[PDB]
Amino acid sequence: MYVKLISSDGHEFIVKREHALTSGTIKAMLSGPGQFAENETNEVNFREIPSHVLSKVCMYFTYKVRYTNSSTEIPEFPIAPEIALELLMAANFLDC
Amino acid sequence: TCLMIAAYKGHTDVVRYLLEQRADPNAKAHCGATALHFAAEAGHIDIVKELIKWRAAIVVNGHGMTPLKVAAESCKADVVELLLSHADCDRRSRIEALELLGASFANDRENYDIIKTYHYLYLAMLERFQDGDNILEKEVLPPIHAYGNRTECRNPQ
Amino acid sequence: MDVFLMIRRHKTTIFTDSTVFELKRIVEGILKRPPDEQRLYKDDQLLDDGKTLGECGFTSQTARPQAPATVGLAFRADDTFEALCIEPFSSPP
Known about the structure:
Chain A is of the alpha+beta class. Chain A has helices spanning 17-20, 24-30, 51-66, 83-94, and strands at 2-6, 12-16, 43-45. Chain A is globular and about 45 Å long.
């Protein structure tokens, strides 16, 4: 019910499976010959993604799942100036 | 006075001519109803627009009944539009008027539109919870056995 | 409740959202660690076991969906866990 994500730097992050399931690419990678064995744990590693961008992605996951179908003014998502360029890259690749 | 009764009848030309004579339209009767109330009952949007053009202000009768609310009661949407557009009001009065309009569409025999009522009430209540963390309160009266359950709704579900 | 946390060990991070031992056996369920052994460090200060959420002083103002509350704790270092910190992430160019 928990999943592990591994960056190219080697940092490992543990996330609730339903939160990580939103992105289509992750779901596609899980559903297949990979991640099909019950004995093996549920982990996914990107040989490409850096650390900070992936961390921003996962806090985006929880922020989105938290303010969903809520009748109110959503808080803005803080984006650093230099981060945005690579964050767009990661969002496009993950198809979130 | 001929002004208020003419507004009730809705003859635009005679009302326009009488107003041309610079007659004060702020006159009152025994009921205390100003010509805006009679125009709202008539529902002539042009008459109300002309009355507003020469500085006719909203005035409340002793027993409530602001002309906007009176127009909303009789299922007269256009007057509600015009008055809300021109006459500045708070959040509470506007939502109250919208809810009254919804109920009037719901129960009366002239229109009897169930969907229009539902959508108007939905819009009003969505406006109630617009801000978030700053919620207009909703007071519910105790149930009446005449209506059965008789409990209002304050959550969108 | 409604308090958002990162748990950080060197090259390891856990995201989560009311006492200290509650966090301790959440960590036990996640990583199978001795609940007594785990020591929590907030601003390099020891967090005693059984301390409630309220005494922490971090409920809503810092625990944010935008940026949750950070918890720089350390796991076991032989008998007791001390001086164990997470490496910083890569600095963008």
